[PDB]
Amino acid sequence: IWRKWHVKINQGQKRFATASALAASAVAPLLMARGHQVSTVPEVPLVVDSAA
Amino acid sequence: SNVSADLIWEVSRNYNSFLVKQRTGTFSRDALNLTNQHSRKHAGFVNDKALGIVPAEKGVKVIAKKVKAANKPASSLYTVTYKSTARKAYKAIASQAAKHGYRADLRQAAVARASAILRSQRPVKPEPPKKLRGAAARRAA
Amino acid sequence: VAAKKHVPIVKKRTKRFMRHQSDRFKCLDSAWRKPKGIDNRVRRRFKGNLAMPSIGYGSNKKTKHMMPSGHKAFLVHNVKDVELLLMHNRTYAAEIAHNVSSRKRIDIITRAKQLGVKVTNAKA
Amino acid sequence: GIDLRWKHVRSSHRKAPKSDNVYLKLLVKLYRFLARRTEAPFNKVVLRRLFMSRINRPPVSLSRIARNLKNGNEKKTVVVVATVTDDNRLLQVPKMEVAALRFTAKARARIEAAGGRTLTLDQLALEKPTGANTLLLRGPKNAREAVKHFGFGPHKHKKPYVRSKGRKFERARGRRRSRGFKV
Amino acid sequence: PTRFSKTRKHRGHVSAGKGRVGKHRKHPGGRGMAGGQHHHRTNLDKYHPGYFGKVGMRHFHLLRNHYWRPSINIDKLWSLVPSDVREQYLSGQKKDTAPVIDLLSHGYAKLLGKGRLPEIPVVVRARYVSAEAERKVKEAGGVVELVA
Amino acid sequence: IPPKPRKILQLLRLRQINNGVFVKVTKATAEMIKIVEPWVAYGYPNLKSVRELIYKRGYGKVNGQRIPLTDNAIIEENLGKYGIICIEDLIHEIFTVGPNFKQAANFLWPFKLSNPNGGFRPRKFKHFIEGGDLGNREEHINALIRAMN
RNA sequence: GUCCCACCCAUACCCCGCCCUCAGGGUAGAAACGAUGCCCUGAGGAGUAGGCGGCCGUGGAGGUCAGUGACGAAGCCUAGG
RNA sequence: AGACUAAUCGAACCAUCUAGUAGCUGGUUACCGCCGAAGUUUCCCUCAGGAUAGCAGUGUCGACCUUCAGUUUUAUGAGGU
RNA sequence: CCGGGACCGAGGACCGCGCUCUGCAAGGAUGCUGGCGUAAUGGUCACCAGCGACCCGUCUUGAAACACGGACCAAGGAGUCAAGGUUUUGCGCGAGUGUUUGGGUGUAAAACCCGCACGCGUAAUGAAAGUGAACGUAGGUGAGAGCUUCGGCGCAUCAUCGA
RNA sequence: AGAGACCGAUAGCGCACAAGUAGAGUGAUCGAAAGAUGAAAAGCACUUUGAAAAGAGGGUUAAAUAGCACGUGAAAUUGUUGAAAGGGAAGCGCUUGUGACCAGACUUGCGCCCGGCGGAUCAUCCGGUGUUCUCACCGGUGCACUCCGCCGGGCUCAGGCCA
């Protein structure tokens, strides 16, 4: 039971990657290549006027 | 900037949802892909300018990409349907792709793809009955 | 339809490279295995024994992977997959998977005839 | 038979980067095209140095740059295919323009504060495709902790592997004539 | 990750890369540092010269707090003042005021002198000071004073 | 093969059976050949033999590659600076030992010959005087060249 | 015992085809490319103990094929492809 | 008589410490591609075994540095078979 | 200079070197004709015939051995894990670097945020008390990729003399 | 009490079952093997041969190729039927022959000329909309030497196997 289950990674590298993923969320060609169905959305950074 | 057509090819070079890879060759099931091959030249979803042909009920239907509205996908396709004549449809497609410098290298593939779709809407002839060579003796009884 | 013109096909070999001493014991399969014995007669290439596979038996790059008709096999599973062969009907041939139902089997064959794609296993 | 001493001998230098950075892949494509269709030797040297590993691209400092900015080199462009590091000893920073792979946070601020300009390897090819009026620089390759242990032996004056340092750890026999001999 | 390691490539090859004549037995040569003076002497003298013997006198109940005195050179002295104030002095806008640096508050006890110093008067308060460091700070107009 | 005669054969560029090269006889090279007696056979070529060999088996070393010589532009591009521009000049330089013999001879890749048509003598590893084939045979090497070419 | 003609055959030598390894070149005012691709040119291939590289299968986990199936999934037999 | 003490005696039977140690026997599981050895030097209660140097592979950098050589020629020394 | 025979046909618009120069044998085969369109060509399996072929694994200078293990089939069956070192490859920051002992928070063993100390590094040397790194544009000489106003300036690294 | 990148009946605790059981030893103590019919027993009435066990008909069921020796039913070993070989072993490698069985491919395609049938609509112009700003679509205008589909006849070229 004393094998190494969890791992440790630098907080600097965690923040780099989560910022890289956010940038790739604004690219429409990448969205289609991941299997999403966005053929009928007006703008790819979709924003709603706080109706919810 | 940090994004370009070349960068997107680097990210999606090895694996993407449209890839169909197996033995003897690889294919791509992409809407904007002519010849259905996996290559930078024919990858419609990465290039800024691309072409696509889809069969309609009577003729071909051609969609193109408008570079001005990349961030608005609901209105980023210029579509038109040709259902008048085979020769007339051929001329319009070639002019649409090689008169104003919009992917002039795709002129040959667009015409050929339209020719195949129209060829597939004709009535089919009946295949001749099969013959027997070694089982003829068995069926003689 | 007929396939593209190509150079003649040469195989360079037809036999199957059976495993040494697999014809005397029932516990050994016929799949080839490299003999690692220190004094094995096959590993030492004695005259009059089984041959060993080498890279010099490879086939021409032009005619590799193509069946005697001239096409290359492509495994399909439904009617949406066979439409991927629209532009490749003189180079590729379709083949229905073994777990496809009988009803979907005749739907695929009907669609493939419109496109002119040859089907290897259709008589069913 | 042919009676040769060597056969199927491979090359000895890297021919492509082992890293999978996407942006670095683009940078290699640009300079691979430039070296093929340009006569400037400056481009061929830059291409190979992009393949090298991290220990073969040691950092250079601001002080080392200021050292080579004398005797008529105040107007040339400094190109360093490596990282550039601020130096805490240098109190006054001269005016210069530098093209480097990357800068630290403090090095970038102090360069532009004096009235300089920081470039990029892609911008460098756009302004000076042939590398005219440039000088290349390297860091100290052998200034590494691991190198001091290389080639340990008698009469070599190298550094030994010890878990600690003190009078109880080695010294003694073989390090002084008072106990046997010396090395 | 065990899927890619050299033990997977040894399947099908007898003796698993350890040799036929020498068969990788249990413990040939002994356990640990056995044989330091008898049969492992040749390795223990080419490397590690000085394993055996006694040197120096011994100390009973050593307390390391009595020997705490970190040192700082003189060329890094100006890095102690904050950046915003530092640029004003070097640029030359004050002309009438001098800084007083407290080494103890930054965690130092001895002021060594190794590099050069610009000609601006300063005041340094240190527990210890070297002979060479006192001269350089004094010829720049400054003074060093012991603080305990 | 003993270690010393092996090194000499490497310096003569004879690393394969049935190879051939041209060398100019001096005191420096006569002693090298005399050491490797039981491995080589040599003699004096005539005009026909040197003419036939260059046309049929002539290959040139270009940038470290074996490029067959079929056009005069290949010879001029590499030997032009020494005054040789055609294939007749190359023959002239070799046959009549000229000032630029060394560069011309080294240009040609070592010749590769087939086994003789009529075969060798009954025992081919004695001296030519005893009844073998290896050694110096003077003008009698022309007959051997006809068969092997 | 000595001399002279003709003739027989090795995985060796010469010419040609094909496979792989190594080395050297060409390819963007892009009518462009699985740029890890394609085209042109040259040489080489025996091997225990041992070293390195590339690939094929088995039990599970995340993503994706809007994947197959009671009109028959998995499994098993088959000098049938 | 080293005899007998539950078919067990020159020191009974049962569980645990215990997976007791072994310089000694036996075994060690798919494929293809490239390179390719040693039984010799010095020390050890050492001689069926280890450390040390040698032979071997892989990763590279400095130049493409014009440097080199199990070779010959010419000049000039040493030797006691 | 004229005969006879055998094996082969790689490449796929034009470009080149040349000649006997309305053309050609000159950077790789084309032209005419006949029978058959199926078991005919071809492939698999069984048998006869010509030539070849000692039982595997292992220790050993040497194994087909009168050296050892092996009657047959199905399932199981052997370089693993942790702490501490070391060189090489990828990545983040860089004279600094490391959130997770602990606290705040949460859709709750996940994710996100915060800081005082502390570890390694920035300074060595002696048994010890102790002391503690610039004569010079951080030195002189010979080689050095690259740059250059063509005069020269000269990174990394190697040797050598000094502080 | 809640869970898992854990094992899936030679695995996982010795025990998924009347398991610390049956059994061995004077005794301390040692200690196994063994899960699965079908949705529902609807677990075969009645006739006939036999001393009986059971057999043959006939029944239930989607299925008895599920019958309390019961889901799926591999190999070693054996029976019947069919084919073949054999003068002190058998098996195997290279190359033909005979017999049995068998996968491919071919069975037309394009173009032109003549004749016949059917339809709306080829060039041109006007209006609206989109767009790569010069290229297109829709509505109207055409109205038979133009355009399109089909059928019949004639012609050129190419296309399977062995020579």
Short mmCIF file of C-alpha atoms in Angstrom, two decimals, chain E residues 20-120:
data_model
loop_
_atom_site.label_atom_id
_atom_site.label_comp_id
_atom_site.label_asym_id
_atom_site.label_seq_id
_atom_site.Cartn_x
_atom_site.Cartn_y
_atom_site.Cartn_z
CA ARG E 20 25.65 -17.55 -19.63
CA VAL E 21 29.02 -18.18 -17.96
CA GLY E 22 28.36 -15.67 -15.18
CA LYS E 23 24.86 -16.48 -14.03
CA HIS E 24 23.98 -13.55 -11.70
CA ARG E 25 24.21 -15.41 -8.40
CA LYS E 26 23.06 -14.07 -5.03
CA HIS E 27 25.89 -12.04 -3.45
CA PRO E 28 29.36 -12.55 -4.95
CA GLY E 29 31.87 -10.23 -3.29
CA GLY E 30 29.99 -9.61 -0.03
CA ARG E 31 27.34 -7.24 1.25
CA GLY E 32 27.74 -3.49 1.54
CA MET E 33 31.24 -2.14 2.13
CA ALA E 34 32.82 -5.55 2.73
CA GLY E 35 36.45 -5.97 1.75
CA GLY E 36 37.43 -2.32 2.03
CA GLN E 37 41.02 -3.16 2.99
CA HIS E 38 41.38 -6.61 1.38
CA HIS E 39 39.85 -7.04 -2.09
CA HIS E 40 38.07 -3.72 -2.73
CA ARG E 41 41.17 -1.65 -1.94
CA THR E 42 41.94 -0.86 -5.58
CA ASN E 43 38.60 0.88 -6.08
CA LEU E 44 38.70 2.56 -2.65
CA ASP E 45 42.06 4.23 -3.37
CA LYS E 46 41.59 5.39 -6.96
CA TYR E 47 38.43 7.07 -5.66
CA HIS E 48 37.70 8.18 -2.10
CA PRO E 49 41.32 8.79 -1.00
CA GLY E 50 41.15 9.18 2.75
CA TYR E 51 38.48 6.84 4.06
CA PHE E 52 40.60 5.39 6.89
CA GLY E 53 42.25 7.23 9.77
CA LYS E 54 41.79 9.88 12.44
CA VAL E 55 42.39 13.63 12.09
CA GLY E 56 41.88 16.49 14.52
CA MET E 57 40.52 16.91 18.02
CA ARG E 58 36.95 16.24 19.11
CA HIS E 59 34.22 18.55 20.40
CA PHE E 60 31.62 17.50 22.97
CA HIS E 61 28.05 18.83 22.74
CA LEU E 62 28.45 21.22 19.82
CA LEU E 63 25.73 23.88 19.53
CA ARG E 64 25.62 25.37 16.03
CA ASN E 65 23.91 28.60 17.14
CA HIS E 66 27.18 29.89 18.61
CA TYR E 67 28.71 29.87 15.11
CA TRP E 68 26.03 31.72 13.13
CA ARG E 69 27.37 34.62 11.06
CA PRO E 70 26.38 34.78 7.38
CA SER E 71 28.44 37.18 5.28
CA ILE E 72 27.75 39.46 2.32
CA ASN E 73 30.22 41.02 -0.10
CA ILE E 74 30.42 44.76 -0.77
CA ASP E 75 29.47 44.73 -4.47
CA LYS E 76 25.98 43.45 -3.57
CA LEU E 77 25.48 46.13 -0.90
CA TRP E 78 23.46 48.45 -3.15
CA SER E 79 21.00 45.65 -3.97
CA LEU E 80 19.61 45.90 -0.42
CA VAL E 81 17.97 49.31 -0.97
CA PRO E 82 14.62 49.17 -2.83
CA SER E 83 14.64 49.64 -6.58
CA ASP E 84 12.61 52.86 -6.68
CA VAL E 85 14.90 54.65 -4.22
CA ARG E 86 18.02 53.01 -5.68
CA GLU E 87 17.65 54.53 -9.15
CA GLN E 88 17.33 58.03 -7.69
CA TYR E 89 20.72 57.86 -5.96
CA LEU E 90 22.66 56.43 -8.91
CA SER E 91 21.03 58.82 -11.40
CA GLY E 92 22.05 61.71 -9.14
CA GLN E 93 18.98 63.61 -7.91
CA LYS E 94 19.32 63.52 -4.12
CA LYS E 95 22.78 65.14 -3.68
CA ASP E 96 22.24 65.87 0.05
CA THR E 97 20.98 62.67 1.75
CA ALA E 98 22.63 59.35 2.58
CA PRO E 99 21.08 55.94 3.29
CA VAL E 100 21.66 53.96 6.47
CA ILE E 101 21.65 50.21 5.81
CA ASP E 102 20.98 47.72 8.63
CA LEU E 103 22.57 44.39 7.75
CA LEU E 104 21.07 42.53 10.71
CA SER E 105 17.50 43.26 9.61
CA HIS E 106 18.27 41.51 6.30
CA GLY E 107 19.98 38.55 7.97
CA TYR E 108 23.71 39.26 7.85
CA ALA E 109 26.40 39.66 10.49
CA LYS E 110 29.71 40.20 8.66
CA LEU E 111 30.39 42.62 5.80
CA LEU E 112 33.06 41.29 3.46
CA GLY E 113 34.50 43.40 0.67
CA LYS E 114 35.10 41.83 -2.74
CA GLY E 115 34.12 44.12 -5.61
CA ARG E 116 33.99 47.85 -6.33
CA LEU E 117 31.81 50.64 -4.97
CA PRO E 118 30.41 53.78 -6.63
CA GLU E 119 31.29 57.17 -5.17
CA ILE E 120 28.20 57.79 -3.06
#
